[PDB]
Amino acid sequence: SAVKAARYGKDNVRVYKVHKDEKTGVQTVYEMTVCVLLEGEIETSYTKADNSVIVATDSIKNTIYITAKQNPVTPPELFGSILGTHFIEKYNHIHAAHVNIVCHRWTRMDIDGKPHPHSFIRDSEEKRNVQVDVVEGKGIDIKSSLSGLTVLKSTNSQFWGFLRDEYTTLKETWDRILSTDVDATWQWKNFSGLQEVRSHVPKFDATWATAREVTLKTFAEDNSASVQATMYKMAEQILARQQLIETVEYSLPNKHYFEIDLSWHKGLQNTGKNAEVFAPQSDPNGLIKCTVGRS
Amino acid sequence: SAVKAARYGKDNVRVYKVHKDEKTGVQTVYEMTVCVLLEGEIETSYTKADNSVIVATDSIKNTIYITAKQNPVTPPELFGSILGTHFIEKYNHIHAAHVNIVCHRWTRMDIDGKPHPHSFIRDSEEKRNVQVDVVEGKGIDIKSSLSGLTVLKSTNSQFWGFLRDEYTTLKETWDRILSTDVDATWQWKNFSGLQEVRSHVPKFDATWATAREVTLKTFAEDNSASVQATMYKMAEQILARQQLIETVEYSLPNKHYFEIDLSWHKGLQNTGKNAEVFAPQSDPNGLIKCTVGRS
Amino acid sequence: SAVKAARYGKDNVRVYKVHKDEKTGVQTVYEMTVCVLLEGEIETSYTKADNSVIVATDSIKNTIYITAKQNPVTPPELFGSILGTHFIEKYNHIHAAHVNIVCHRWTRMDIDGKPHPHSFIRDSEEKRNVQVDVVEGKGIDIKSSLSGLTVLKSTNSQFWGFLRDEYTTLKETWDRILSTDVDATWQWKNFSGLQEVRSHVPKFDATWATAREVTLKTFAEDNSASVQATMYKMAEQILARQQLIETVEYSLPNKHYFEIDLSWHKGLQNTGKNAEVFAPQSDPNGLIKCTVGRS
Amino acid sequence: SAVKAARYGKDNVRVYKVHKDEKTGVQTVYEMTVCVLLEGEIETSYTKADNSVIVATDSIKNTIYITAKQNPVTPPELFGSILGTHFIEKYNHIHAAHVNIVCHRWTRMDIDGKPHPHSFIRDSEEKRNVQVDVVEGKGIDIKSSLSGLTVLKSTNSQFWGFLRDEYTTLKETWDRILSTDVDATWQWKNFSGLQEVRSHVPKFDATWATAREVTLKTFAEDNSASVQATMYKMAEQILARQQLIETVEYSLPNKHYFEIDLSWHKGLQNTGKNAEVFAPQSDPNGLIKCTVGRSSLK
């Protein structure tokens, strides 16, 4: 046998960092879950039980804290690159680092129409993630995204003209409920090193806000008959507003709402134009994926 | 042996309702999970295997759907009362109905700084619930609540002066993080019947908004060395602002954030006054409860 | 206002203990999640923010570990009584201690047809729990239970004879799938103190086994048209076999499996006597409860 | 801009099938969750909102049910093949079918020392899965695995001799607790088509049982200084017991049990040789992976 591939590291490392302003007295908090996986000349740890090439995962957890203490944790795209570079630079035998970061929401509270200096609320289970691959000699690869974004539109969505055969029973519709969770991922053009990443810092937070805004707006305004076409319009706008992006990827898990026919009960009308009460379905669910690039 | 208590019904009944305004064309959606358990002279289903006294759980389901279609599903406190009343009025042997409703958040999307007519977002995992108890010849008991409200304050929270013995290792503190999930419940005075509940409708949504605002404010502004003291303050205000309320119950699971001593590494200062990076703890967690009533 | 009720303590405290047999060298492991809530003269901590009467929840945690170290953690009924007793006896202003324990399975591995001395496998997600209420001058109250026991019988289950009205659409059946999670609890007669509990120790593990065996046996053998009737028989046998038990309580959340009509496709027969493929339903579900006592 | 990649289908389709032996009266049940994703000339559905090329997800669901009714659902490897094949063979514009199947346990109950004819128990949250990729003109690729296998050994596990530096605080140990959730996947050699998969049907259940056995036994008996070394040995044996296997992948999440120092309480000894009470840690956790293949050395 032979080791064709190997990674290892620490997962689920929860980190919280606070920023205090001595002047204004305002405080800002950052909470995220980090995962670091290493690659390199560690083959013997598997084949010869040689631990000498092993940087303890516990030490990888230590490095994460230490790094967050000496560096800025925002934007996550930067912090990830810093954390990733450290490993391939500090350890001669390590040649790849894979960093995953999940950012939780801690939105500043508004008390009496005013932003509180030190109170926060988790206003959503929506996440801002980044997957940064740092490979020796090959620069830095970044993949930004947002997930856990749940949306619904009560009308202005249709579905007809689809293939029909001996396996179809679905009835075409010109009005229906469209609900889904949004997983959007934008891949940045390869970066040569930390210095290049550092120089584009301003673009990160901006592009994210751009991705979020485009998604919501397009979703809300688009009177579709093809979820596929809807997400394609979403990817176009993103690619157009940010030149540094190489590809945009969407993954929309459809959430179905069934009509309930109650006519059997005193001629109760609750279908088609009279549909008012629906039964949300936990499963199954449609899944539509999409990767869009430049011509 | 003998049956001392029995209940049965349908759980996890997902429901969705949409209200359309022909005039403006603005739509509104409601989604919730309903549970209905029944009580009465049904012992024989257990003892003699007699089903004749059993109202099918599938029919309880049908009923929930029908009820929603024929009535207003908001406020929940009202809808719950109607649904519970239905069973004791339609069945001779049914003497009590216990309805549990969980309302999910579908916040209206703001596009271009203007509310969208038919697009929604799940802006939180926070819920608004109700527990209605309809008992023949004893009125309707209603318990309202809000849960899943997660907050954190980076300062202005202390803890000192607590009991100290041979089992204590916790050091006193005058500045720490305070994070928790909020579970607040207010119990209304017993209503005589559907009519009376219908007469106080406007107080349900208002009392809920009030309970929410007081919790958020008190938490944010109170600088106490006692989570206990803070929650009592919240209950006080709620009881003072709504006379129709008998008791207010709070249950706060204290989520801890530990200081990370990094001194062992090049004398890095990250404790006490220099504490910037913390480690969130998934478990365990303090749990503080409290039921406040009137003198 | 006035404090009607108050509790507080530590929750989700994970504990693991290993017992090494000094003769054979065989190791047995125990793992469980503990929760401890205290009651007593602590009102002032809420009304006057007086922390002097507060035993830190951190100390509560510490006490759990220490107690586990100096005492046997099995059976959980004993360990819960020891832990509960400690708090009311060590603190004068503490009058009640509510201990909840969840036991996780760590089944010994059989390797090559022989029990391994120190390797375990988490076979089920089924738990064994205990709730122990230790109240000063009122003895020790113990509620044992098993939960998370999932079973299914493809046949020998019926449902017909139930009530039928204008809300009924369900067809009666004489063959159907019965699946459900099992939640069984057995209340022990009130115990005077730790001394009494200790003397009845051998009865705890035994009865749990009995409850589990009866539940499984009855469910599999009973050919009934009433779940309610099946659970009652379960309760009966448990009360007959153990006199120290006062009441048995079952809570069965049904899991439905619908037939799938496939006649629209080449007249495929998949209903009634030809039903082979079914569609498991996540929700909603029927919930049947029952508390049985002695005449 | 342009469409680089595109898939779509039905996810989380729960299925239950029962087999009744009219002779013996013994019934056997099967439950699984299926996911089917399709690929092909469907770019227009994105670029020009053309649903004409779209096979409704609802119809994909119906198809799973029909296929389940007309064919065996065991072993999963076979069923996934039968299902993926159907799509590329029935739709000219559909070129690839990605089928994911999760198998839920329903173990027959033993009552009074004998197996019950129609009663089962969910004796574990452990699962048996398969990922089948049917591509037009490329054959059938199969990835079988087992997951959710949680194990723990209270001793006979060590960790010393690792790299130490200014970021290191961990102390060396010669006796510790080793617990982990096992995730094992074995890739089969490419199959030309359905007929070839059918011929090998018997190897599927046999290899699954071998992988599970090898995993448990090795975990139990190995006294290794590294989880890496222990998972390598497991892969070795599996590759050695089945020649149709090309690679074996292992993903082990080391769950930690920390010692608790109680000496601050009357000098109570609870560390090292005296350790009895441990604190299980929910997070974070170590994560070790590795893909083992066949050597080129003769």
Ligand SMILES: Nc1nc2[nH]cnc2c(=O)[nH]1
């Ligand atoms: N087995 C094992 N234990 C560890 N503990 C900390 N790091 C490691 C590692 O790489 N392997």
Ligand SMILES: Nc1nc2[nH]cnc2c(=O)[nH]1
């Ligand atoms: N066994 C059983 N099946 C049901 N199906 C619908 N309602 C019921 C009920 O009360 N018991």
Ligand SMILES: Nc1nc2[nH]cnc2c(=O)[nH]1
């Ligand atoms: N606020 C608060 N913090 C604690 N930390 C430890 N115990 C307690 C308690 O009772 N209240």
Ligand SMILES: Nc1nc2[nH]cnc2c(=O)[nH]1
């Ligand atoms: N939008 C949309 N709705 C569907 N409903 C069933 N299949 C589909 C699909 O592919 N797209």
